[PDB]
Amino acid sequence: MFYGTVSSPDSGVYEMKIGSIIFQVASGDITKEEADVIVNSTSNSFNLKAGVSKAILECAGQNVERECSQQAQQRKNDYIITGGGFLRCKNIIHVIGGNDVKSSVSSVLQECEKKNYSSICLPAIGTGNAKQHPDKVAEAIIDAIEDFVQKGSAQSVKKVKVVIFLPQVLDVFYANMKKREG
Ligand SMILES: Nc1nnc(-c2ccc(O)cc2)s1
Ligand SMILES: [Cl-]
Ligand SMILES: [Cl-]
Structure with missing residues (x-):
């Protein structure tokens, strides 16, 4: 009762409608994207600097690193919201790669509505240091967006968009989109 048709609007980009939301996937470096929010997939200490967390913390800058450590030593956080530093975004949301991916994406969507934001870019959360299986991660990300739409929560x-470092992981996301398409 939600899914549109899978097509390719731009070279290496695949998209489909999920209710009112345009869902897109592509391969590339997420630190070159522009969006209201960029998502970082990190550790429970919010100081991982390996794979996607290395590229995001390096390009964001030491002021963002300082924000992460300052918030981390204040309370036990499921995720942390910082400034964009030198990334092309208004905020970074740092989620824990080992956590339930559906719950992490649900939290990102709810925080973006609170700020009246329109665009989100995320990596294949949990497929790096956390070593979650790509097929399970794709199913969880798309399930979170479906639930948000079903509850009537999508307004802003x-x-x-999922920007994915390995082309082989992009292929798993595209197969999931074709499984669901109207
Ligand atoms: N096995 C891997 N999963 N993630 C990787 C990654 C992601 C973003 C980067 O900027 C660099 C490496 S390698
Ligand atoms: Cl990860
Ligand atoms: Cl990725």
């Missing part, structure tokens, strides 16, 4: 959020 219009575009959710």
Whole structure:
């Protein structure tokens, strides 16, 4: 009762509608993207600097690193919201790669509605240091967006894009989109 048709609007980009939201996937370096929010997949200490967390903390800068450590030593956080530093975004949301991916994406969507944001870009959360299986991660990300739409929670959020470091993981996301398409 939600899914549109899978097509390719731009070279290496695949998209489909999920209710009112445009869902897109592509391979590349997430630190070159522009969006209201960029998501970082990190450790429970919010100081991982390996794979996607290395590229995001390096390009964001030491002021963002300081924000992460300052919030980390204040309370036990499921995720942390910082400034964008030198990334092309308004905020970074740092989620824990080992946590339930559906719950992490649900939290990102709810925080973006609170700020009246329209665009989100995320990595294949948990497929790096956390070593979660790509097929399970794709199913969880798309399930979170479906639930958000079903509950009537999508109002400001219009575009959710997954930018994926390995082309082989992109192929798993595209197969999941084709499974669901109307
Ligand atoms: N096995 C891997 N999963 N993630 C990787 C990654 C992601 C973003 C980067 O900027 C660099 C490496 S390698
Ligand atoms: Cl990860
Ligand atoms: Cl990725």
